[PDB]
Amino acid sequence: AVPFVEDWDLVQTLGEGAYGEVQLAVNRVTEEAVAVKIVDMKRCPENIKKEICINKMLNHENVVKFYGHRREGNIQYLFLEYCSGGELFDRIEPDIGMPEPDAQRFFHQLMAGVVYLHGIGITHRDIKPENLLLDERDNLKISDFGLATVFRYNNRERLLNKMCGTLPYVAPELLKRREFHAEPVDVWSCGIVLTAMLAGELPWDQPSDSCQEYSDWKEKKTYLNPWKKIDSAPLALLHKILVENPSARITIPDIKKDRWYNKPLKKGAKRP
Numbered sequence: 012a013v014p015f016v017e018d019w020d021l022v023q024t025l026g027e028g029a030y031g032e033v034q035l036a037v038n039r040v041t042e043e044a045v046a047v048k049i050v051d052m053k054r055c056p057e058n059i060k061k062e063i064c065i066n067k068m069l070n071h072e073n074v075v076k077f078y079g080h081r082r083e084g085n086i087q088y089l090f091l092e093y094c095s096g097g098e099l100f101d102r103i104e105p106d107i108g109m110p111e112p113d114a115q116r117f118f119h120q121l122m123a124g125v126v127y128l129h130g131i132g133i134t135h136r137d138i139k140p141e142n143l144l145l146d147e148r149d150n151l152k153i154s155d156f157g158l159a160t161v162f163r164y165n166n167r168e169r170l171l172n173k174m175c176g177t178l179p180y181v182a183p184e185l186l187k188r189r190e191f192h193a194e195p196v197d198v199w200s201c202g203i204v205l206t207a208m209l210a211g212e213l214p215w216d217q218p219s220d221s222c223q224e225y226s227d228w229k230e231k232k233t234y235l236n237p238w239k240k241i242d243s244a245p246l247a248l249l250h251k252i253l254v255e256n257p258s259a260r261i262t263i264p265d266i267k268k269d270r271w272y273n274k275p276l277k278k279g280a281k282r283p
């Protein structure tokens with residue numbers, strides 16, 4: 012009933028992805044802020060249709076909320092949660108990382124989001140710092156479900172075979188096997204994200220035997236560049252996550268039992 016409540020103004024550009032751009036939209040009356048993903052279909056009906064479907068199913072504090080979508084010819088307008096904190100990528104100092112306590116807390120939030128997604132049967136398939144957003148209170152939110160898919164339906168898991176994601180964050184089995192379990196792949200990418208937060212660098216371009224960096228990790232040369240600056244406890248967790256055999260790689264339930272995962276490190280927000 013209130014007059015101009017449905018009008019939104021596009022204040023600025025949050026980031027222009029490969030397929031389009033994302034803008035910060037402010038409500039004309041209430042001044043509520045939201046992000047609008049703008050994609051030009053004439054450049055894909057199938058992809059965007061799936062992304063919208065998966066987003067409608069999501070409702071969790073560590074997953075970017077989906078408010079709705081507006082047709083408007085061939086310019087899909089996806090209204091999503093606005094995270095003023097930006098990308099986790101920008102909170103990682105090159106070659107340094109960030110304070111261990113912050114990384115632990117961001118890792119906890121990441122696991123909560125992934126447990127939720129996997130619990131509802133969907134795999135993200137492209138977990139990386141650029142898709143992990145921070146809200147005003149620094150709470151992590153998993154975003155961009157353009158590459159996500161359902162791996163469990165009617166309590167029956169389906170193996171994946173499509174190759175997608177981002178090389179540095181991709182699990183080795185995706186490059187070596189024809190079919191693979193969805194869950195271990197997201198676990199692996201979360202491991203590369205943790206390494207990034209603690210070392211401020213990616214360990215390898217891709218998890219292939221041909222990649223020298225990857226071979227050195229499998230040979231346990233932890234005295235080398237990335238691993239040397241991490242620290243015992245979290246390093247032990249990484250050894251369990253970045254395991255080549257996906258069937259031997261640690262699961263999320265066990266990650267929540269890991270020593271570093273449960274180590275008291277960070278206090279609450281200064282002055283409650």
Ligand SMILES: NCC1CCN(Cc2ccc3[nH]c(-c4cc5ccccc5[nH]c4=O)cc3c2)CC1
Nearest residue numbers: 024025033046091092093094095096097154155
């Ligand atoms: N003065 C203009 C600059 C432009 C770059 N900007 C960094 C920055 C701050 C907040 C910020 N929030 C985003 C978002 C992206 C995004 C992508 C996909 C789904 C939902 C959302 N929601 C967002 O919320 C991206 C981004 C990026 C700092 C201000």
